[PDB]
Amino acid sequence: AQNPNCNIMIFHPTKEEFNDFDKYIAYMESQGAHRAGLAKIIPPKEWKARETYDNISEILIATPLQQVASGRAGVFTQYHKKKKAMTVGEYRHLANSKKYQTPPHQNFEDLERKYWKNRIYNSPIYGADISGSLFDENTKQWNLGHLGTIQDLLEKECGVVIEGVNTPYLYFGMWKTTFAWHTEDMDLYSINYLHLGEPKTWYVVPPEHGQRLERLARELFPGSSRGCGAFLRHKVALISPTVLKENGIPFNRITQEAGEFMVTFPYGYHAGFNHGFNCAEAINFATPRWIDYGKMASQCSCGEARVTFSMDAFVRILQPERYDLWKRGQD
Ligand SMILES: O=C(O)CNC(=O)C(=O)O
Ligand SMILES: [Mg+2]
Ligand code: NI
Numbered sequence: 001a002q003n004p005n006c007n008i009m010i011f012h013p014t015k016e017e018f019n020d021f022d023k024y025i026a027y028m029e030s031q032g033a034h035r036a037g038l039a040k041i042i043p044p045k046e047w048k049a050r051e052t053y054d055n056i057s058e059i060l061i062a063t064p065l066q067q068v069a070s071g072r073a074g075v076f077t078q079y080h081k082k083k084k085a086m087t088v089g090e091y092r093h094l095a096n097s098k099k100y101q102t103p104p105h106q107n108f109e110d111l112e113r114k115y116w117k118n119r120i121y122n123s124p125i126y127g128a129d130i131s132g133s134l135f136d137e138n139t140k141q142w143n144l145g146h147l148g149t150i151q152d153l154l155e156k157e158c159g160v161v162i163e164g165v166n167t168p169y170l171y172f173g174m175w176k177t178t179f180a181w182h183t184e185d186m187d188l189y190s191i192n193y194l195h196l197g198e199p200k201t202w203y204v205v206p207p208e209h210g211q212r213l214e215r216l217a218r219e220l221f222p223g224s225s226r227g228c229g230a231f232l233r234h235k236v237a238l239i240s241p242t243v244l245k246e247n248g249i250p251f252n253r254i255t256q257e258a259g260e261f262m263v264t265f266p267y268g269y270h271a272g273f274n275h276g277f278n279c280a281e282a283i284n285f286a287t288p289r290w291i292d293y294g295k296m297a298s299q300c301s302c303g304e305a306r307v308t309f310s311m312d313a314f315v316r317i318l319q320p321e322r323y324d325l326w327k328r329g330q331d
């Protein structure tokens, strides 16, 4: 069995190997990459996502989200308070202000320490989930707006034709902006490209041990667990590495830098934080190996998770027994 310890693997494809996206995902899996839940892909030196970023300040963040925490430093939830719209230029200036800027620090490890110690005492503002793309249309390799769609994958594998679309999203981060512990909708893959700026630290639980994290989360967030049998779908709970280690939960950590891709694999729980002002682009995708995870994915039916239009067909086809209850939580 490849990668039996479930370590995060880092890949350096050549320009030739960067042509065929599906083939390279399958290659990484042949080497056991999926067992970690997360992989890093460093593009060949000849590749570029676009020529410059010199012209991005006019993008609009319609609904910036202030991430307010409750709990203790290592075990907390965050809620998103909506803020007034601002441009990326306005947001970048805000990020770089004395109130929000990255503190002085020695290295990534020191910054990680400061994050876990101090995150709860601040409310950073995140520009998340903005539909759009920063890949140049002339970028032919690993262009996250030109991937094969999840609907087409389900149609190719299963023969059924469904509605829905699959587009990328932009994330504008600042110091301490936080992504809570989650798997993707329908336990899909994700791919994330860090276009510019400061790093993003990731934590991940191997898919084979995801239920260990779920059981700890039920213990640590007992009211939330009573409210909903899949409350991690709410994407609000944080648990630190120190707490994970204390409870014996297997996990790994890695820091993504600008110019790098990360792939999350089906049912790979992940969480993390941004080091400073940055911009990432991400999208969900499927492969044939996903289909069995899609069929088994948990679902939130309490009303909180509310998701895209395109998840309807996934539930309806893959999980017909669950469909009626889940759709009630959508409506
Ligand atoms: O970058 C972020 O804030 C969150 N991204 C992801 O969870 C992802 O790409 O799957
Ligand atoms: Mg612009
Ligand atoms: Ni994710």
Ligand SMILES: [Zn+2]
Binding pocket: 227, 228, 229, 230, 231, 233, 234, 300, 301, 302, 303, 304, 305
């Ligand atoms: Zn729920």
